Design a protein around this ligand. Structure first.
Ligand SMILES: OC[C@H]1O[C@@H](O[C@H]2[C@@H](OC[C@H]3O[C@@H](O[C@H]4[C@H](O)[C@@H](O)[C@H](O[C@H]5[C@H](O)[C@@H](O)[C@H](O)O[C@@H]5CO)O[C@@H]4CO[C@H]4OC[C@@H](O)[C@H](O)[C@H]4O[C@@H]4O[C@H](CO)[C@H](O)[C@H](O)[C@H]4O)[C@H](O)[C@@H](O)[C@@H]3O[C@@H]3O[C@H](CO[C@H]4OC[C@@H](O)[C@H](O)[C@H]4O)[C@@H](O)[C@H](O)[C@H]3O)OC[C@@H](O)[C@@H]2O)[C@H](O)[C@@H](O)[C@H]1O
Ligand SMILES: Nc1nc2c(ncn2[C@@H]2O[C@H](COP(=O)(O)OP(=O)(O)O)[C@@H](O)[C@H]2O)c(=O)[nH]1
Ligand SMILES: Nc1nc2c(ncn2[C@@H]2O[C@H](COP(=O)(O)OP(=O)(O)O)[C@@H](O)[C@H]2O)c(=O)[nH]1
Ligand SMILES: [Cl-]
Lengths: 450, 450
C-alpha cells in the first residue's frame, strides 16, 4: 500500500518524487491506520488549497486585503531553526490550519524545497517569493506591532488584516494567550496569520475547548498525530532519497533485524564521552536490544544478523560498539554489524540533506534508541511509528542510572508549554488535567500525547 | 587428500580441529586457488614432516644434538636452522617462509624462536610435532645481541679470513654487507652445509636469490614448476591463525562482507612521518580504482545491480571515509551498489592479532590494490594468490602518474638482494641474469620471482 491506508492521495508524478510511493519497499507497514474522518479532512484540505492557494484568483484578491470580509484564510509558517525543529513546528502549524480552516503556506527559507517534495496534489505549498511581507520575516518578534502578545501587553485590541504569533521558546505570558479559547475566537477572524516557532506545540491544542472535540474525531488514537501528519507532509526530494536508498542497500538491507541508536550529546565539548558510551551499552544490553559479549574460551552452539545504525555528530560511540563486537564473540551467537553514515562534527545544503536522510534511515529500523531532548530523534521515531527507548539526559558527565527507559508513546515532546488556566486566570500544571496529555519522559516540564 | 579442504594435497590431514579452527575451515571463506602445488612439493612437505618428527624439539635426537654446542668444534643425525623473531609482522611472515624454504633445500629442521607472540598468532604447522624453539635452548639469551661483529657471525669470519664449527650465526638483515652476502654463494653454502646449528636473523624475503645458486636451482625448479608460486604455497602451508585471531576474521567477514557479489581490497600504507591522511594519496586511490575499472565513477550531474564490497586497511581511516562519502553522496555511473569497510584505525597483542586478521581478510578479496614497499600487502596477496595492482610510492607529495600498475606476479619482493657474481668474484646485476628473477615494480633495487 503506497497510499498508507488512504493517508496519501494517488495521482502524483512518480519520477519527480520517487520517495513518495517508492518508500513502501523500505519500511514495514505501519499498524496505525488513519481515521476515516482524518482522511476526509485531508482530501477536503486539498480542495481548499486548490481553491485558495498561490496563483489563484482568490489568493490575489486576498493579498489586496492585506494591503488596502473574504472567503480565504491563511497561516504562514516561517522557516527558522534546526531541521528537527522545523519539521515538528511545521507539522504543528499544519494541524492548526486544519483546526481553523486555513490554508498553510510554507516559507521556503534556504532549503525546504531542496529537501521536501510537494505534499498537496496539484498545487504547491510554498509561499511565493514575492509575498509582500517576506522582508519582515527576520525582524518579526515580540516587539512587532502586529505581534499578538505585544498587542495584548499594550492593550491595543474592526478586524485586523493580519497578526504575528510569537510561539518561539522565549515567549512570554502574553504570547501564551494564543493557547486560550477566548483568544482563539478573536484570532479566528483575522485573514492572515504569520507563525514563528521552534516547538512542537500540538499537545496544548488538545486543552482548548472546541479544538478538543475536533481532535478527538481526527485522531481516535490520540498519540498518532505526528505519525499521520508527518508521513502525509514530508517526502524527501530525489536528491535526499538517493542518500537513503544508497545507504540502505549498501549497509542495512541484508539484516534480519535493525536497531537504530540516535545519539545526541548536548555539550559544547564534542567528546566522545566515556559516560555516554557506558550509557549506551548499558541501555541496549539491559533491554535485550543488543547481546552481551563474553570472554570464555569454551563456546556453546543459523545466526540472525542484526544491523546497528548509529547516528551522531561524533563517530566515537559507533567505533566503540564496532570494536567490541569485532573483538569478542557474542554470548547469543548473533552477528552484529555497526554502521554510522556520517560524522559532521556540528550543525551546518549537503549537511541538511544528510541530516534528513539520517532521520529517515533511523525511521526504517525495527527498534529505536533516542537521546533525551533531541527533536532529531522525535522526527525519526514519529515517521517510523516507533516507540523508542530514551537515553536520559546526563548531568555532571555522570552516566544516568537507570540508563534509559521506554517512552510512553511515539509522539514528540512540547518543550516549552504554557502553564496557565484560561478560565480561572491563574497558573496550573497543564500536565495533570487529562490522562492523554502527560509530562514528557526526557524533560520534566514538557508535554506529550499518550 | 587432495581435497580443497587440504589445499590440493598441500596440507596433511589428521590435525585436531578444535585447537586450530582456521586450518581446514579456511575453505568456507576463500575461493580455491587455481595454483596447484606440484606432487614433488607435496612429497617434500610430507618428508619434511617425517624429519621434523625424528629431529624435532624434545626428541632424543634433538637432545643429543644440543650437546654439540658444548664445544667449539664438533657427525650427527640432525641439522637445524633457527629463525630469530625479529621485526614487524609482515617481515616476520616473509622471512620465516624464506628460512623454511632454505631448510627444505638443505635437509635441516626449522626451529622458530617464539619471541613474544608467535604461539599467540599461529597454530602448529608440522603434524605431530611443535615447530617452536624450546625456551631453555642454550643460546636464546644471545639472540638480541648477535650481529656483524659477533665472533660467530659467518660474515665476520669471512672478512677476517679465519676458517668443523658447531654453530654459525648468519646475519641476513637488510643492513648486512658484502661478507654477509656471501651466504648466497655456492661455495659458501658447501662450507655452511657442514655446520649442524645455524642461527639466522633476517627481515627480508630472500627467496629469489636462492634460485641463482647452483644446486638449489635444480631442486627449486622441481619443487615449483610455476616459479612465482613459492610464497603462495609455503605461506599457506606454514601460517594458520590461532582461534583467537580467526575469530577476528570470521566475525568481520560475516558482519560486513559476506553478502557481496565482488570484493575489492585496498591495502593502504603511507611511508611518511606525518600520519596524514594526504590528499595526493586519496587522489591516487581514486584514479587507480577508476582507471583500472576496479571501482565505478560516480555521476555528479544526475533492475538487479551487483553488490561490491570495498575492504580498506590502513592505519588512518581518512581514505576509506572519503571513498564511503563519495559513494553515499553520488550514484554510481554503472548502477553498481558500493559498500566501503575498514576494520581498524590503529593509528600507528590485540594489535598484532588485528594486523594478522586484516592481512587474511585482504587475502579473501577478488581483486587487490596494494601499496609499494609494503610487506603487509605482500603477505595478503601471497596468501590469496592475487596479482595486485600496485600504488606506486609517491615522491614530494605528488600523485604519481600512472597512479598504479599491475604487478608482474603475486610474489613478494626481496628488498635487499646481493649483487655479486660468485664465480667471477665481481659485482653483477642479479636482476638481469635469468628471465624468472627480475627487479620489482615498486622498488627497482629489489628482486622478485616472475
Ligand atoms: O539550577 C538551575 C540552573 O540551570 C542551569 O542550566 C542547566 C539547566 O538548564 C535549564 C534550561 O535549559 C535550556 O536548554 C538549554 C540547555 O540547557 C543547553 O544544554 C543548550 O545548550 C546548547 C546551546 O543552546 C547551543 O546554542 C550551543 O551551541 O550548544 C549547546 C549544547 O548543545 O541550550 C538550551 C537552550 O537552547 C534554546 O535557547 C537558545 C537557542 O539558541 C537554541 O536554539 C534553543 O534551543 C531550542 O530550545 C527549544 C526550547 O523549547 C527546544 O528545546 C528546541 O528543540 C531547541 O532547538 C531550556 O531551554 C530551558 O527551558 C531551561 O530553563 C528552565 O526552563 C523551565 C521551563 O520553562 C520553559 O518552558 C515552559 C514555559 O512556560 C516557559 O516560558 C519556558 O521558559 C523552567 O521552569 C526553569 O526555571 C528553567 O531553569 O538544566 C540542564 C543543564 O544542562 C543546564 O546546565 C543555568 O545555567 C543556571 O544559571 C541555573 O538556572
Ligand atoms: N547528519 C547528522 N546531523 C546531525 C546529527 N545530530 C545533529 N545533527 C545536526 O544538528 C542538528 C540538531 O538540531 P535539530 O535537528 O533541531 O535536533 P535537536 O537539536 O537534536 O533537537 C541537526 O538538525 C543536524 O543539523 C546526526 O546524527 N547526523
Ligand atoms: N592493523 C593494521 N596494522 C597495520 C596496517 N598497516 C600497518 N600496520 C602496522 O604496521 C606494521 C607494518 O610492518 P609489517 O607488517 O612488517 O609490513 P610493512 O611495514 O608494511 O612492510 C604491521 O605489522 C602493523 O602492525 C593496517 O592496515 N592495519
Ligand atoms: Cl571522557
Amino acid at each position: 500500500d503506497k497510499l498508507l491506508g488512504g493517508l496519501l492521495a494517488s495521482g502524483f508524478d512518480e519520477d519527480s518524487c520517487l520517495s513518495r510511493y517508492q518508500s513502501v519497499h523500505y519500511r514495514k507497514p505501519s499498524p496505525y491506520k488513519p481515521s476515516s474522518y482524518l482522511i476526509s479532512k485531508l482530501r477536503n484540505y486539498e480542495k481548499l488549497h486548490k481553491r485558495c492557494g498561490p496563483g489563484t484568483e482568490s489568493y490575489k484578491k486576498a493579498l489586496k486585503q492585506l494591503d488596502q470580509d473574504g472567503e480565504c484564510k491563511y497561516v504562514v509558517w516561517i522557516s527558522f531553526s534546526g531541521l528537527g525543529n522545523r519539521i515538528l513546528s511545521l507539522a504543528s502549524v499544519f494541524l492548526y490550519a486544519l483546526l481553523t480552516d486555513r490554508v498553510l503556506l510554507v516559507d521556503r527559507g534556504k532549503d525546504m524545497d531542496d529537501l521536501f517534495c510537494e505534499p498537496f496534489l496539484g498545487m504547491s505549498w510554498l509561499l511565493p517569493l514575492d509575498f509582500p511581507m517576506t522582508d519582515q520575516f527576520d525582524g518579526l518578534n515580540q516587539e512587532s506591532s502586529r505581534c499578538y502578545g505585544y498587542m495584548v501587553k499594550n492593550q491595543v485590541i474592526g478586524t485586523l488584516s493580519h497578526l504575528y504569533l510569537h510561539l518561539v521558546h522565549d515567549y512570554g505570558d502574553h504570547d501564551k494567550m494564543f493557547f486560550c479559547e477566548g483568544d482563539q475566537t478573536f484570532i479566528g477572524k483575522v485573514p492572515w496569520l504569520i507563525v514563528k516557532t521552534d516547538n512542537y506545540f500540538v499537545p496544548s491544542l488538545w486543552l482548548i475547548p472546541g479544538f478538543d472535540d475536533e481532535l478527538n474525531k481526527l485522531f481516535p488514537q490520540k498519540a498518532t498525530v505526528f505519525h499521520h501528519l508527518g508521513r502525509y507532509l514530508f517526502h524527501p526530494t530525489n536528491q535526499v532519497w538517493g542518500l537513503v536508498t544508497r545507504y540502505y542497500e549498501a549497509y542495512l538491507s541484508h539484516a534480519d533485524e535493525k536497531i537504530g541508536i540516535q545519539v545526541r550529546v548536548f555539550d559544547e565539548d564534542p567528546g566522545p564521552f566515556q559516560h555516554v558510551m557506558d550509557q549506551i551499552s548499558s541501555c541496549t544490553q539491559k533491554e535485550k536490544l543488543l547481546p552481551e559479549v563474553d570472554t570464555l574460551v569454551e563456546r556453546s552452539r543459523t545466526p540472525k544478523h542484526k544491523a546497528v545504525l548509529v547516528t551522531s555528530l561524533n563517530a566515537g560511540y559507533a567505533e566503540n560498539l564496532k570494536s567490541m563486537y569485532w573483538e569478542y564473540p557474542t554470548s547469543t551467537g548473533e552477528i552484529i554489524g555497526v554502521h554510522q553514515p556520517s560524522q559532521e562534527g556540528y550543525q551546518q545544503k549537503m549537511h541538511n540533506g544528510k541530516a534528513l536522510a539520517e532521520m529517515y534511515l533511523l525511521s526504517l529500523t525495527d527498534n529505536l534508541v533516542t537521546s533525551a531532548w533531541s527533536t532529531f530523534g522525535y522526527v525519526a521515531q514519529g515517521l517510523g511509528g516507533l516507540k523508542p527507548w530514551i537515553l536520559y539526559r546526563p548531568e555532571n558527565r555522570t552516566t544516568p542510572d537507570p540508563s534509559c527507559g521506554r517512552a510512553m508513546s511515539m509522539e514528540p515532546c512540547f518543550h516549552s508549554p504554557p502553564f496557565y488556566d484560561c478560565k480561572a486566570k491563574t497558573g496550573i500544571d497543564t500536565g495533570t488535567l487529562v490522562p492523554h496529555v502527560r509530562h514528557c519522559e526526557d524533560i520534566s516540564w514538557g508535554l506529550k500525547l499518550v
